Structure formats: structure tokens, C-alpha cells
Amino acid sequence: NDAQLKFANDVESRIQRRIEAILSPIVGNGNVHAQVTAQLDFANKEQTEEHYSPNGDASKATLRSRQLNISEQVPRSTQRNETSNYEVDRTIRHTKMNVGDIERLSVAVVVNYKLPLTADQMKQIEDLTREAMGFSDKRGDTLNVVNSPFS
Amino acid sequence: NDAQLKFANDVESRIQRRIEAILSPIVGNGNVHAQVTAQLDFANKEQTEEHYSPNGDASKATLRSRQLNISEQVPRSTQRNETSNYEVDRTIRHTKMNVGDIERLSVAVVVNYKLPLTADQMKQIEDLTREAMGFSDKRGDTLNVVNSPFS
Amino acid sequence: NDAQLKFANDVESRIQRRIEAILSPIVGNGNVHAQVTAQLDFANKEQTEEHYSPNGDASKATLRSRQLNISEQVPRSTQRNETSNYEVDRTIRHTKMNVGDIERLSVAVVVNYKLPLTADQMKQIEDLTREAMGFSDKRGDTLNVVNSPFS
Amino acid sequence: NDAQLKFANDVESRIQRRIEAILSPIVGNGNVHAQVTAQLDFANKEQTEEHYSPNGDASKATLRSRQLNISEQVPRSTQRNETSNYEVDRTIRHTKMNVGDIERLSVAVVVNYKLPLTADQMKQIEDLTREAMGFSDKRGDTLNVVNSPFS
Amino acid sequence: NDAQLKFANDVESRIQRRIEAILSPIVGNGNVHAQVTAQLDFANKEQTEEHYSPNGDASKATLRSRQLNISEQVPRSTQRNETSNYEVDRTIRHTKMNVGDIERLSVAVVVNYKLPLTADQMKQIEDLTREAMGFSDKRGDTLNVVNSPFS
Questions:
Q1: Which residues of chain C lie closer than 8 angstroms to D102, CB-CB?
Q2: How far is CA D98 from its chain centroid?
Q3: D44 touches chain C (CB under 8 A)
Q4: Where is the composition biased (Polar residues) (chains A, B, C, D, E)?
């Protein structure tokens, strides 16, 4: 059960290699460092939807039977019994989610100096990293690229 | 059952290596120290939702049957029996949570002097660490970075 | 059953190493002493919630059946029988709490003199220790840092 | 069953070492003596709550069924039968308390003379000991620190 | 069954060592004598509470069913049947008390002369002993410290 720290370190080290491999051409072979933090989902999880389709509108219902009596006398004693058995469209998904999916990523990138990099030259580094992470805003991913001279 | 102190020390030592590895380029190889405290969740925990979908609106219900009598005499003796059997959309999740997830993190970082670091140079260290923790405010994570000369 | 004093001493000695390791850079290698007291929870404990969702509002109930008669004569003899069978959303958690969690921490820290430390230099030591404990105020944790010359 | 005096002496000797270890830096290596008395709980004890949630307010009840007849003639002969079957939220804890927890602590500390210690220098010794005990006022803990010359 | 005099002598000799060990620094190595008398409880004893929670107030009851008829004619012939089945919150403790707990302590302390000790110097000896006993007034503990020259 501590093989999930080994697994989560494989997920981080692959995202991290990908970020250094795509920035090493630009800034240089060793002028960039990235560290990735992944929150993974190791919870088992099943699910079973069972949608039905609304048949409240008669122009899209599917009757199997229908007994419609319509008495009427004329003092206007009316009447209108009406049974209706239906056939209903039914979807039934049944997922069994994957154990070990990324829930959220946090990436920190430091790029060396050349002398600071240009603000435009630094946006095209944020955007490259935003594709090497697989940056999704619906996961709540976070990226921080800073520019500062190494040692 | 004291293998949870070994496990919680693996979680802390990985977050701690990640914080030193991303700050060592900036401040220097040994001018930064981080100590991480993780409160983990070792409680077993199952769950089983069983949502249904509201069919109170007839424009989205799904009838299986419907016997609607509507007598009426005209002294206006009316009547309107109406059975209705429904089909209901039903989701059924069934999670089995993971034993050993981080509930809350506390990180303490001390960075050496260069001579204090600039207040801007110290924010870009708080923000880098905020990504090396996986800092989540909904977990109640806490970070403290202080700048003070070593020995 | 006295292996709980061995376990509670592992919990204390890890918090204590973490406090000395994060203050040794500042004050010096041996100018700080910390002693941690942990009240642990060794009670076995299960639980089983079983929440339901309120369906008192018809715009969010889920009917399975509904037999609604509405007689009426006009001396205005009215009537309105109305059975309603419901489908109810039901969560069912089932926790089995962990044996050996920290209920409350008490930490006492003594830091040597340099000559007293500055009141600001002593707050940034209380705050570092507040992160090396995992200080939670909802647990009722308590910390006391005093500054006084050693022997 | 006299292994509870051995156990209660381990609880006392650990609290006592912790108090001498945190005061030895201040007052000196052998100028402080502490003796701890612990009243432990060796009673076996189970428990089983079974809370329910109040559904007296209709805006938070969960009906399973509901047969509501409302006759009425107009000499205003009214009527209003109303069965209601409910679904109720139910928690069920089941603790099995730990055998050997501290119920109450009593600590007595004597610190040597330097020449009496200052009243402020003696409060910062009461407060350090109040953290080395794990002093809880809800347990009814008691501490007495006195200052008097040794022999 | 005379192993209870051996056990009660272990309880007394531990409280007695603790009182001499905390007063020997003050008065001297052999200027203090203490004798402890413990009344122990060797009665076996079980117990089983079974509390319920009052549901007399409708704003905190939990109904399972409720059939409420409310007839009424208007000569104002009223009526109001009302069955109500309840769900009740129920705790169930089950203690099995410990055989061999201290019911009451009696401690007698004689401290040598220096020349009588000061009335203040003798209160700080009563208070130290009051912590080395574990002095509880709800047990009916009794302490007597007298000052008189030895032989």
C-alpha cells in the first residue's frame, strides 16, 4: 500500500522528464528545473446510472396497450377512462473507475538567466509547460514558472 | 500498525526532497531547509450513494402505467381518479476510500541569507514551495517560509 | 498493551526530531531543545451513518407511484385522496477509525541565548515550530517556546 | 493484574523524563526533580450510540409513503386523514475504549536555587512543565512547582 | 487471596518512594519519612447503562410513522386521532470496573528539624506531597505532615 508512493513518483517523473525535454532546446541543457506534484485517486469506485427517457409528451411515447373508453350522454354526463401501458427507453451505464488517475497537478519550473528572459520569451515557456503537464483547468492544475539565476 | 509512521515519513520525505530540489537552484545547494508534517487518514471508509432523479415535473417523468378516469356530470359532480406508476432514473456510486491519503500538510522552510532576501525574491520562494507541497487550501494546508542567517 | 507507550514514543520522537531539525539552522546545532507530549487515541471505533435526502418539496421528490383521486360535487362536497410512494436518495458511509491517531499535542521548546533573542526573532521560531508539530487548534494543541540561557 | 503497576510506572517515568529533559537546559543538569502520579483507567468499557435525526419539520423529513385524504362538505363537515411513513437518518457509533488511558495527572517539581529564582523565571518553568505533562484541565491535572535549595 | 496484601503493599510502597524522592532534595536525604495507607477496591463489578434520549418535544423527535386523522363537523363535533411511532436515540455503555483501584489514601509524613521549619516552608511540603500522593479530595484522601526532631 506504499506501492502508491512508488506509482505516484512514476507519474511525477514522467511529467517532469517531459517538461525538461521540451524546454532544454530553448533555455539550454541544464538551465531548467521542474518538480511535479500529483494528487492521485486511489479510491475504488463503481457506478451504475440507469437513465430513462421522458415519455410525458404523447408525440414521443411508445404505448404497448391503451384502453380508452369515452362515454357521453346529452345535463351533459361525460366520462373518459383511459389506461395506458408504456414501453420506455432505458440506458444503463456501468462504469468501474480506474484506480490511480491524476486528480490535480502542481508544477514548479525554474529557468536560469541568459540577464532576465523577456516577458514574451517567458510566456512561450509557460505555454509549452502548460502542454507538457497536460494542464487541465477543470482538474485545478497549477503551474508556476519563475526566472532567476542559478548557482 | 506502527508501519503508518514509516509510511507517513515516506510521504513527508518525498514532499521535503521536492521542496529542496526546487529551491536549491535559487538560493544555493545548502541554503534551504524544509520540514514537512503530514496528517494522514488511515481510517477505513466505505460509502454508497444512491441518488434518484426528481420526477415531480410531468415534462420529465417517465410513466410505466397511467390509469386516468375523468367522470363528470352537469350541480356539477366532477371526479378524476388517476393512478400513475413511474420509472425512475437511479445512480448508485460505491466508493471505497483509500487508506493513507494526506488530510493536511504543514511545511516550514528556512532559507539562508545571501543580507536579507528581497520581499519579492521571497514571494517567488513561497509560490514555488506552494507548488512543491501540492498546497491545497481546502485541505487546510499551512506554509511558513522565514529568512534568517544560518550557523 | 504497553506497546502503546512504545508507539506513542515513536510519535513524539518524530515530531521532536522535526522541530530540532528545523530550528538547528537558525539558533545553532545544540541551542534548542524540544519535548513533545502526544495524547493518542487507542480506542477501537466504528461508525455507520445512513443519511437520506429530504423529499418534502415536490420539486425534488421522486415518485414511484401516485394514485390521486379528486372527486368534487357542486353544497360543495369536495374530496381528494392521494397515495404517494417515493424513491429516496440514500448515502451509507461506514468508517472504521484508525487506532493510534493524535488527539492532542503539547510541545515545549527552549532556545538558548545568543543576550536574549529579539521578540520578532522569537515569533519566527514559534511559527516554524507551529508547522513542525502539525499544530492544529481544533485538536487543542499547545506550544510553549521560552528563551533562556543554558548551562 | 499487578502488571498495571508496571504499566502505570512506565507512564509516569516517561512523563518524568520529559520534564527533566526540558528543564535541565534551563536550571542545570541536576537542579530539578519531578515526580509524576498518574491515575489510569483499567476498566473495560464498550459503548454504542445510535443517534437519529429529528424529522419533526416537514422541510427536512423524508417520506417513503403518504396517503393524504381530505374530504370536505359545505354545516362544514371537514376531514383530513393522513398516514405518513418516514425514512430516518441514523448514525451508529460503536466505541471500545482503550484500557490504560490517563484519567488524571499530578506532577510535583522542585527546582534548586541559583538565591531564589525570579517570579517570572518561575512562571516560564511552570509553563514548560505544563506542556511536558500534557497538562489538561478537563482531566483535572494538577501541577506544583516549588523553588527551594537542595542539600 | 492474600495476594491482595502483597498488591496493596506495592501500591503503598510506590506512593511512598515518590514522596521521599520529591522531599529528599529539600529537607535532606534522610530527614523525611512517609507511610502510606491505601484502601483498595477488590470487588468485581460490572455495569450496563442504557440511556435513551427524551423525545417529548416534537422539534427533536424522530417519527417512523404517523397516522393523523382530523375529522370536524360544524354543534361543533370535533375529533383528532393520532398514532405516532418513534425512533429513539439509545446509548448503551457496558463497563467492567478494574479490580484493585485506590478507594482512599492516608499519608503520614514526618520531616526532621533543621529548629523548626518555617510555616511557609512547611506548606510547600504539604503541597509537594499533595501531588506525590495523587491527592484527590473526592476519594476522601487524608494527609498529615508534622515537623519534629528525629532521634
A1: 39
A2: 13
A3: no
A4: 75-86
